[model samples]
Target: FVEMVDNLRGKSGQGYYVEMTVGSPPQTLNILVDTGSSNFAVGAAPHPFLHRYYQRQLSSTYRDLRKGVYVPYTQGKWEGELGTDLVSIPHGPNVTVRANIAAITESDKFFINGSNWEGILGLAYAEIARPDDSLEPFFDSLVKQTHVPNLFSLQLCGAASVGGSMIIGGIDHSLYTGSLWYTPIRREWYYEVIIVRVEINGQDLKMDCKEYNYDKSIVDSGTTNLRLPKKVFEAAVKSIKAASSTEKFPDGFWLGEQLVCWQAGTTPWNIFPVISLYLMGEVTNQSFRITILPQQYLRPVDDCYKFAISQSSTGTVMGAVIMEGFYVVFDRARKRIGFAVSACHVHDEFRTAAVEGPFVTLDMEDCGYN
Candidate 1:
């Protein structure tokens, strides 16, 4: 197994980052470990934090596709050229797996609390990588060319950056404890599975999510918070509106997608209802469930209720907050996604490895959805 350590940062250090080397003699660049996107960009213009660039003129194998790769997020866009280069992620003992890479021109982000990493590395699927259809994700390329298995794992650290590690080819049994639960991937483009049911507290806060399919959510390591569908977001808000457990802000302001404010130390979050999500499982032929607590869902903003939450039609992107709770696995070989309670769970708390066994296998016609 090959593993490389990455770091997290920002307000709670919720971000995931790793080192990627590009070009012939390989220039090492620190990048965000994003499963939400597939377009890669090496910042052409220097940011104050990671003042690095992918100078195409210097690389011998550089071939410009003459197409601009444009990647858009909730905040900004990255515009760059679609090009090729030799890429490598070091695999210990000085061994490396080299593959043809899809290189981006790059953009600017406000992260990097000044530690030497720059740019975004797209870890999602290649289809999501825009502009050029030929460009595939580096991992996909890595597995295909080498004798590696079609799997990768992450043991992310919380509250601070640098304690987590990424296993590229196979899983590191020592990183997490307990059997890895498996759920089938419904649609291949995103790391999506079926979400059979969703509940808040004990109430069925239904959002008519089944109008589409159970594959309505994306399990992304790149995103920060839970972003549900627009209608679902509204329904959840209304549920809280009628419930006695949650109270409104006297003077609430908008944050991200929600207009929220709460009195400081006035009411415990348990005063609010808990949110739970039930997903289909290949292992039991029963629903596999996950939950988020009030402390996780509600944020304390200055002395007000935690930060406000809003909704979007982008479906549901289960980001870092939700992911920290479990040891999740993306099994392309089995065409299934897996999860188990994590040893590395809870914010700022480091965990020691324990025993989790027998990998979860699957069938293409797995039940429910993520």
Candidate 2:
């Protein structure tokens, strides 16, 4: 769930130490990177959701080290304290981790707007309190106390396009030539799979695994979108409105109608199916793939629903638009997560059939109050 390393020095290059938080009442920031997790973070100086380009400076080597930093989100609450300074990162240079700067009595609620990125580089997964047994996993305590192992890799080159790269400690093998599908992890923390069956285009759909109680399922590349459960998201929107032809947006279903957009060379309405997961023994096919993006962007009356999720009781949350071109991998010293099929432009290369069960362990207590 977390792995960050990239600190070079003597050679006069390399730096990606991360962990951050400053001003506006929120503090506890760490940084260093290789790829990305959306906008990373750390910018709230003049407030108002800043982001005009960003550029603020001040740090001599950070030291305060706030007594016990904290970060809780729902709507407004960021406090501040904690320090470790020395940050530059533009074309990439001048790096030095451990920071939480932002305590001029909390800089009026901080804000940044020349945008070159002043702070904010997170990938998620870190909740330690004390123990400090040599920093068990603060990214391996800065890779064995600053020896450096923040390994990195991210070749999302082009598909829907977004620009990607954050290789800190490892992974650069010439930016992927092709052929790697690994899959293994299960408890070391993240990357767990096991669905078995879900066919749609080819037919066969009767899931209901106790409405996804969870025996294994956590692939999260920092989450772009894709999470299930309301009876597998109404059986994946009733198999994309029965193989699309159009007309189902009173508040749901989308992808640029005309049978779900994209049609020059061809291949659009697949509406997801063949979704096989069952790892360990083998069987990873994601078939039919997925992509429903429209109904004005997913209901809530419309306005692109800002990443809609009207709350389906409790279940279904897949991201990255169903993991786009797919090439996912997260070994984490062998925890597990592997997938292939990605000839660049997007989607193609299917396979499915592997349904086993018995792990369990996901009971959100109905949804009333816990």
Candidate 3:
């Protein structure tokens, strides 16, 4: 899963309300800014999944600025109606922009899981447009109307903590730490980066040791696990294992005395190299780090390991685990993407400990019993 910005806490420390509409009749629901996915959806009354956490407040401040609105997901499911509403962000004044707020009434998928969230505010490009089903993303429409390129940046605070703001229509100057590292985006919507080199240690690990291909790589925020080719994946795993050779671990996932447990106050195994995603003249982003789960955590019985490697088939999906504590900015108009280390504080203190060995026997017994 990708780290997303859920709400906008303005400099004034007040939440700004954005209007949401449901289905063709356009039942209205208010929402906040979200930067995880690319759709704007809301929950409404009578939903199969409606719960107490679903905050509902009525306000006549927004109206149907658009006569027609439709949004479709990648799965070919139609999720909501489009409308122009007053969108306000914290520290910023309200602006009436064209938005596709989901109809809470038509949300069948949202009802199944019984989620606490009333709606979702997607920030990606729309795959289809109103009535015609044409692919028209929200940012696309914004750029077309403004006649100038628009750049959007997201600052995700905390790994799983909530209450962060997303700024659309402009960049949050305060959130930005320094100069932006820009890279040209391909004609396609995704910001593509060339895999100039895939090295293990200082050795170049390219296909032919020299040839570089741009089309082979993709930058996607939606993907949770980093997908790579068989050779690349194996190489990465080998490198990690080699680095952790000094650590002790049982043959079975944490079953033996040799097992190293991060929770037992053991120093973490550093498998991370200065992995660089090179673009243009210099390295665009470096210090790419990945965590190797404890041997016990990799067992088939553990769902966490299964979940981590579940989607290993789709090339390499870069999950939030690798992107944790980082700020990623998608500049569609500029044809470039930028990243910076995140400033948000991670509240989960337990995660800081490095677990190198397998799960403790007692731990497994407790989990199994529970």
Candidate 4:
């Protein structure tokens, strides 16, 4: 059986989240669906950013494992106690599983000020689970308890009409169109994929293929931007500047510190070029291209726009900016990730992105091998 969760947009439509019930009395909370990490944690102690927290003492089914788990991020960190409790998805499979949970007691910046989520439900594998992989990840436990296929799919709707859709145990064919493009999972920890090239309009960024996977590229639902390695990022920025006709913008515009504005209904989608990423396909010596039009990369903010691509030193991350344009399937059952044009990728009958090819492949070296 398959379970579908309504992916709700977080405050200001910046992130996608879903609701989950934890504990015996079933304390329901809005959970950030993060694919970057594997720790099903909730705010258990008082936090300035949290409106609600999971009170383990109030639940009769709570079991303390007497273990500690800590997770650090580029933005914040959280440390907590490992415990077990009955968890269920009210909008999903509805099967309750006694799952491993990290009840957060102390945190810094991890919650972030004014974020809408009270907990984070990690969807990655146990390999990256907090503390150690000995602790079963939430999805793993769910699959074990329910006998569902070890796979799930995500459709982030951007700031469009609906927020998003997350189907566990299977795919929702109605949410996407055309054939799904498959790319092998080069790494099991994160949804890592090998990128062959980056293109602006139809021109390649012209960098060593090695740089694209300098530290390994991943598709993370928790991240907000399409983060590229430093070299690839800089080159992408240069190409954008050379390709666009927009002139006289503040340096902060590219630095992502400032927003650019234009007259109402006169947004410069035409001036900006389409961006594409070529990924190593499932078939040997074959690759495919996923292209995001200007509308998908230039996020709409109130009366302005913000560039949705950024630079990263750790590696490249294909975040919401790119994911929102496709129905992404994390097929752990087959060890591949699938991408198809999303039903929500359309706005007033126009598409925000395109997926093309069984394009000829290029590049050598096992990009995932570190």
Candidate 5:
């Protein structure tokens, strides 16, 4: 039953670009999806005439897959060499998939500059592929030659546009509402899970360690916050400075991503309450919590009150303010990973629901995995 078609893609600034097209008179551009980096690559300076780069002289199903491929970036690098094309995703020149790109030739020189994005469409997986470990991506090249289905659905909605969209093989059930849960996927180098514990307003910051260990988290939608590690951000900054009073940021310093930033406010959702995180399900051993209220992890942005960024390097990293309004689902062929409550957030009874039937039915026995 694979025909959940989804070509809804649109957004701007701070991540969001997926307009493909690689060869044979099909040179469309604009790639930048990045599920925490995988590597598709392009740019080597803007040319703009063809909208820029990858002009293996305008296709004919171009194939060159090797020269000196390279990729390395927490933020910049993609040296280039490695090609093959038959493009179309954001520019389906009559649709033909069969891609594996990277014509970079020394990037970040233009790629990350301009940031209008001319490349980067690594939807995570393949042990963070690079230089092609037989790299295939782009949804395994349309789920092994079209009819495309292995699943994909990321509703994001952070700045809102109906809160954003990006469904590839299915899931628009009106962008979520309740009880979708499912969480297993112990690391293929990005969608990792298995934390089993972590709290704040209910207290439990020991973080089950041997002096470190974050219990393996890692969600990362190009990470926009929540980056612990450094003794789990020093036990969540000593339990949020023992439930708030004052400590750094206002100018005294600390913006590694805001550990505290305030000047005034009565709306930190009126001062923190839950931080939870649990997870570690299989047969219900009791942890799958995931709460984290306090207006979804405190923030002020222009000035005052902040406490979400904490990564010096211990690694728990579950960004996007731990997915505010949630509705995530990176479900790779039932490998397991889902979340709900995103009808624009703030609903009750399992985070609100009543889709009644627009597409809200995926009961994998509420998940335990096989």
Candidate 6:
């Protein structure tokens, strides 16, 4: 089953959401597709930022699971009542699952002002599910009920593009080009992976590979920027500045805390360096490079420029800025993730998400083993 996801870039928000049919009478809503968290939460009460909410009283099939949930995210938190109801993807497989839902009664920063998504569809495993790990995630329930393939693929066409597609159950060959690079999943939660190195224009940062995944690293579609660990982010900023043009921008520009603009007609892409993440492959001694060109990471905000990379005290988070360059596969069945060059990642001059090798890692330290 395939669902066409709409990319919304509001003044202060950016997310990719899919239309979903929820409840007995089929109330449709736009749900954000998130891979970092495992709680399927929906708006059930009117809020300042929400346009609509689920009317539980109107859905005959709605059942209160009698659980209260208080889930906190890296940037937002929500309190809700746990319930179950018939849920289906009108654009996906013709199947309905009695999926768990967190009817959001309170929230902060989860739904951005002017955001169109009313709920979140978490795609990761149940390990991070709110309330308890015993609860099954929405995707798990869908796979169990329909017996569909336990894998899904994502193609985010960036925050400015028209849209992208999310393919459930199997892969769609036409969406990507070249070979699919497979990397072992280091952890079941958050699609965690081992990143062996960070490169700026193919130049290594020269840090111990363990620094790349000091806390944990993940490929998350829910986040909008390329978040790097503190040390890595500083190194990348310095490397990028030194490797690029002679003109120096303010420190805040590289910090991702301020926006700057070039001359109206000047293009900044040519002046920025390509960013690459070398990931440890399924074999300990093998690795591959998933690189994103400047077009994907150095994003423009109207006439101004905002670096789409940020510093994360937690770990490296490859978000939409990086994801827009590839069609990512969450292969839970095999405990691996695959990346292929996305059809949308290419333009006349830029062909981002370049996949390089099953590079022999004999010369480098095995980050996975360490």
> Which ranges in model 5 have alpha carbons more than 4 Å from their true place?
1-33, 36-52, 62-111, 114-118, 122-137, 140-142, 146-198, 201-218, 227-239, 243-276, 280-317, 320-331, 338-370
Q: Sort by lDDT, best first.
A: 4, 6, 1, 5, 3, 2
Clashing pairs in 4: none
At residue 359, give the lDDT of candidate 1: 28
Winner on lDDT (3 vs 5): 5
TM-score of 4: 0.94
Indicate which candidate wins on TM-score: 4
Tally clashing residue pairs in candidate 5. 9
Give the Cα lDDT of each candidate: 0.60, 0.35, 0.39, 0.83, 0.59, 0.81
Off by over 4 Å in 1: 1-14, 47-50, 60-68, 72-76, 90-95, 98-117, 160-163, 206-215, 240-267, 283-285, 299-305, 347-370
TM-scores, all models, native as reference: 0.77, 0.30, 0.58, 0.94, 0.33, 0.93
What's the distance in Å from true for residue 73, model 2?
Answer: 26
Please write out the lDDT profile of model 2 over residues 70-146, one tens digit for every residue.
34334433444434343333222223344233332232332323222234443323322222222133343344445
Residues 1-370, model 1: lDDT tens digits = 4335333333343467666677767787767777777656676555555557667777776777776666665676667666677776553213344443434445434345565556666767877767654677766767777777787776655542434566766666766666666666876777877665567766877554362233367888777677766666667666655554354543243234444544654544445555667666666445556656555555444244443345656667777667766667777788887776666665322222222333232432343345
* Residue lDDT tens for model 6, 85-163: 9998877666799999999999887777777779999988888888888889999999888888999888877644346
> Which run of 10 residues does model 3 get worst, by summed lDDT?
361-370
Task: List model 5 lDDT by residue over 1-370, tens digit each.
Answer: 1222233333322455656777878777777666776667777444442247767755778888656677765776658677777767752213478777777766543344444556777777767777655676666777788776677766555542213456676667776765676667765656776655566776877545322234446677666677766776767766765575442334222344434544453343433455666555544443355665555455434345455556646357676666645767888887777777666554333332221112121232332212
- Model 6 residue 339 CA deviation in Å: 0.3
Assess the local accuracy of residue 100 in candidate 2 as a C-alpha lDDT between 0 and 100: 30
Residue pairs in candidate 6 whose N, alpha carbon or C atoms collide under 3 angstroms: none
Error of 3 at 178 (Å): 5.8
For residues 80-106, what per-residue lDDT tens digits would candidate 3 score against the true structure?
Answer: 444443332233323334444434445
